[PDB]
Design a protein around this nucleic acid. Structure first.
Ligand code: MG
Ligand code: MG
Ligand code: MG
Ligand code: MG
Ligand code: MG
Ligand code: MG
Ligand code: MG
Ligand code: MG
Ligand code: MG
Ligand code: MG
Ligand code: MG
Ligand code: MG
Ligand code: MG
Ligand code: MG
Ligand code: MG
Ligand code: MG
Ligand code: MG
Ligand code: MG
Lengths: 50, 71, 98, 78, 179, 141
RNA sequence: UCCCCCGUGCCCAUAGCGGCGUGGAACCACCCGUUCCCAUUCCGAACACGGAAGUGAAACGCGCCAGCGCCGAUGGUACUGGGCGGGCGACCGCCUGGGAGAGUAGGUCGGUGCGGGGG
RNA sequence: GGGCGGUCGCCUCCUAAAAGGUAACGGAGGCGCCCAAAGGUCCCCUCAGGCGGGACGGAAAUCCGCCGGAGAGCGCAAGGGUAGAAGGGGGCCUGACUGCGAGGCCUGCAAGCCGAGCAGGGGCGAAAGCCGGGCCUAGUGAACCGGUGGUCCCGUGUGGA
RNA sequence: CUGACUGGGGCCUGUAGAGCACUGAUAGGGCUAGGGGGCCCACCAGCCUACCAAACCCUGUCAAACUCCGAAGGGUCCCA
């Protein structure tokens, strides 16, 4: 709460999200991630401000 | 092994003070003098400082006999 | 008291045991919780070759053809005291496949 | 002069749920345990909270014997 | 390669016969390893670690020592976890004799104290920390990296049991006596 | 008085007083012993009142031995207080004793003086406590 | 149809600890080097590789030593389902079954499988 | 008795009577979190203390040898368990996946938890195998009304909104 | 014919009891890291402590929140 900055990871090309946090206090800024979408078959993922 | 930060320890000859120095391992060829300075059972390697180098007219027997005049 | 004990998991219930001495090697295949050694191929019991790391190819073919001769395929491989390095005893017959 | 401390947690209700000599199915929890008081033997799997369950069905058996912990053995029927 | 090895082989191995030893092949005492440590000197020389004692230490013996961690944050001596402070090295090879024959012959002169070191510094199982004071003046280094006094600490570990069996070795190898 | 200086927890329960002795029947220290016969509690005031009544009675010789130690806090609520609202305060530590346990053991005191001294300290306690001497009833083999 | 040694097991301290022996023809360990495949917050100590001129000192096996540790019997209560009573209370007594933990005697420094080597 | 004071939910130990449960304004304490590593796989090592020493050093910094079988540590209070790792160090990655889930523990119901295994596509390891977060138990909130993306399902005669 | 209950077999516990090997308190005795200190000495070149006291070992204990141990019983499953 108010340190975690709970967010969701975007498809980075079209649509989906992944719903896991990234801290604002510790400099974990712009963390790339590979995750499993439905259609695009294990492409890369990045953050969103929501 | 680990070639890298570990240097090759380039050979260099020390100036052979007390016999042959242990040979060319490090690149530091200079000593002051006298690698051993003695045979090392420490055979009184003195240079005669403030102690008994000057032994005339002190640490001697002056002013007469062995002092029979006491009582 | 050094031991690593990679032989403790035992999910697969059939393993190939490897012992590397400083002179030569020998290997067995054990069946778990029964205590019966099925087949084995031992250097200096069959005295194949002098160089100790050239043993692994000929004892790999020999233990492989004796394993297929005894009719066991689904085997495993232990790494108790030793690294998977140096001798490999690589094979292409039997379900170990490494 | 008031009551300092009078609250208590709700019990998570652990314990041995399937004793030996019992016919089971694939998936029955043999013991709900807090720590791993029982170690897995044949056909026994652990989970997240150290809970071990049966992989196959059969007559279960305990205590293969000690020196490492108590054992659970789901033994199949033949 | 060869550095006082004749004194290593025919001034030790037959000299340990007829007065010491059980006179078989391996219980005659010998050298296993000689550990060498910095231990920061007195305290932390800097807030951030600088890694230059690996450079002048790699100059005097030609190898890098491992900078190892610290224990639990007791914080009476501003103790902390991480930011490693160890500077320990064993380095047992013939490279042991490469530096040990240098400091064996250069460190007993060229530093000033009472003549020699303790024969009471022997410990159980024969491992003998000798404990020189500083030697950054004349380890033939010519004042390179004079930050502080900044000594080091040596322990020459024998093989045998007793202090008379390490004492059988070390001053027949060339150590002083009675301080 | 006396009290234990450190505890894991401050307050504890009461329980029951059954059981025979759970150790403490053989004397093994002195030549006499004051042994109890009824289950009750031993307050630190009962320890002090019986301990002073020895050193004030016999003088200049004879070491007194006590083998009782209060580790049970007697819990009592304050006066004119209704029920509930937690436990009461701790006033004095008591010592649970069982029948047939030897509490007080004189040392270096003769027959006709130790019977009298243990008789004086016997009336300081709320328990029928008879007096036993050094017999051959030890636990030796 | 047997002894010795090496792998791999089951018994879960009657298997260990400590001391005293003993063994390398035969395995195994130690050793001599690192030249490459490999490595070390650093080092061939441990993994890895050529060996193998020397060894059983260390470690490792076997044998002995009960004190160190451990295991530990028959009785005897403590305790207690169940039933019957006593005491104002704190708490006790009897019968029927069950039956400890300590302590004592005593035992032990191993028992038993499978696959290989030598005679 | 009511008022004043304290408490209202979750977790740990006891009370709690050797299955589970079990009350009191009974005792002792914690929580409304945190970790891109404090996660997964693979590969190495065994701790805390005591003794003998040291160059400073408190008797605790760092180093060596012996004893030490778990008295340390496991983010956090307590309990269980752990060195035949879950502990400490290093490489590579994000399974801190998506659709499901046999069979169960417990429960009045609602909830909470374990989950072998199937498909797609991955990570580690040569493989055997593991990975659907954290050694575990606390770290939270049913429903309703709405906010932001995708889905193009409905969209009031028709086509769109 | 499965039920309450009972008989024959296993499994489980940590209560009564008992115990100090673990967690703490402890009545004494021996040893004495050291400390007000030292009879007082060129300080280490001591001596007994009737001064205090760490840690260790015995004779002895206590515990709902201690268990190296551990029943009687209870629950569960198979047969009657
Ligand atoms: Mg071990
Ligand atoms: Mg391992
Ligand atoms: Mg190994
Ligand atoms: Mg009364
Ligand atoms: Mg219960
Ligand atoms: Mg009950
Ligand atoms: Mg982890
Ligand atoms: Mg592991
Ligand atoms: Mg439900
Ligand atoms: Mg964690
Ligand atoms: Mg319209
Ligand atoms: Mg329309
Ligand atoms: Mg029936
Ligand atoms: Mg029934
Ligand atoms: Mg019955
Ligand atoms: Mg109890
Ligand atoms: Mg009791
Ligand atoms: Mg029973």
């Amino acid at each position: 709460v108010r340190i975690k900055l709970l967010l969701e990871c975007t498809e980075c090309k079209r649509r989906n999200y992944a719903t896991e946090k990234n801290k604002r206090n510790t400099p974990n800024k712009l963390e790339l991630r590979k995750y499993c979408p439905w259609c695009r078959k294990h492409t890369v993922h990045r953050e969103v401000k929501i | 092994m680990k070639e890298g930060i570990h240097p090759k320890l380039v050979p260099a000859r020390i100036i052979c003070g007390c016999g042959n120095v242990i040979e060319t391992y490090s690149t530091k060829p200079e000593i002051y003098v006298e690698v051993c300075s003695k045979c090392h059972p420490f055979y009184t390697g003195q240079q005669r400082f403030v102690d008994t180098e000057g032994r005339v007219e002190r640490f001697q027997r002056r002013y007469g006999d062995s002092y029979r005049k006491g009582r | 008291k050094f031991r690593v004990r990679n032989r403790i998991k035992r999910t697969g219930r059939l393993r190939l045991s490897v012992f590397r001495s400083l002179k030569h090697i020998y290997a067995q295949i054990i069946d778990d919780e029964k205590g019966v050694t099925l087949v084995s191929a031992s250097s200096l019991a069959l005295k194949l070759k002098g160089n100790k790391t050239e043993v692994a190819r000929q004892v790999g073919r020999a233990l492989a053809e004796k394993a297929l001769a005894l009719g066991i395929k689904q085997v495993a491989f232990d790494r108790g005291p030793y690294k998977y390095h140096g001798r490999v005893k690589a094979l292409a017959e039997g379900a170990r496949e490494g | 002069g008031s009551t300092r401390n009078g609250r208590d947690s709700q019990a998570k209700r652990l314990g041995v749920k399937r004793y030996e000599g019992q016919v089971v199915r694939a998936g029955n929890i043999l013991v709900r345990q807090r720590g791993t008081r029982f170690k897995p033997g044949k056909n026994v799997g652990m989970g997240r909270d150290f809970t071990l369950f049966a992989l196959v069905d059969g007559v279960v058996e305990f205590q293969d014997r000690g020196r490492l912990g108590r054992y659970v053995h789901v033994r199949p029927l033949a | 390669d060869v550095a006082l090895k004749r004194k290593y082989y025919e001034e030790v191995r037959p000299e340990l016969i007829r007065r010491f030893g059980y006179q078989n092949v391996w219980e005659v005492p010998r050298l296993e390893k000689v550990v060498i440590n910095q231990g920061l000197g007195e305290a932390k020389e800097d807030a951030r670690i600088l890694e230059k004692a690996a450079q002048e230490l790699a100059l005097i013996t030609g190898q890098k020592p491992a900078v190892t961690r610290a224990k639990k944050s007791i914080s009476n001596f501003k103790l902390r976890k991480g930011m490693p402070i160890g500077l320990r090295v064993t380095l047992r090879r013939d490279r042991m004799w490469i530096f040990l024959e240098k400091l064996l012959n250069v460190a007993l002169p060229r530093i000033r104290d009472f003549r020699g070191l303790n024969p009471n510094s022997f410990d159980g199982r024969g491992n003998y920390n000798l404990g020189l004071r500083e030697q950054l003046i004349f380890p033939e280094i010519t004042y390179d990296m004079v930050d502080a006094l900044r000594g080091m600490d040596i322990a020459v570990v024998t093989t045998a049991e007793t202090d008379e069996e390490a004492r059988a070795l070390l001053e027949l190898l060339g150590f002083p006596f009675r301080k | 008085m006396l009290m234990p200086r450190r505890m894991k927890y401050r307050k504890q329960q009461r329980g029951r007083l059954k059981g025979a002795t759970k150790g403490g029947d053989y004397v093994a220290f002195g030549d006499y012993g004051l042994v109890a016969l009824e289950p009750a509690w031993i307050t630190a005031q009962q320890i002090e009142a019986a301990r002073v009544a020895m050193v004030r009675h016999f003088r200049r010789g004879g070491k007194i031995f006590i083998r009782i130690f209060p580790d049970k806090p007697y819990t009592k609520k304050p006066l004119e207080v209704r029920m509930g609202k937690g436990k009461g305060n701790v006033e004095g530590y008591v010592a649970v004793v069982k029948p047939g346990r030897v509490m007080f053991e004189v040392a270096g005191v003769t027959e006709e003086q130790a019977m009298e001294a243990l008789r004086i300290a016997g009336h300081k306690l709320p328990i029928k406590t008879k007096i036993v001497r050094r017999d051959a009833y030890d636990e030796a083999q």
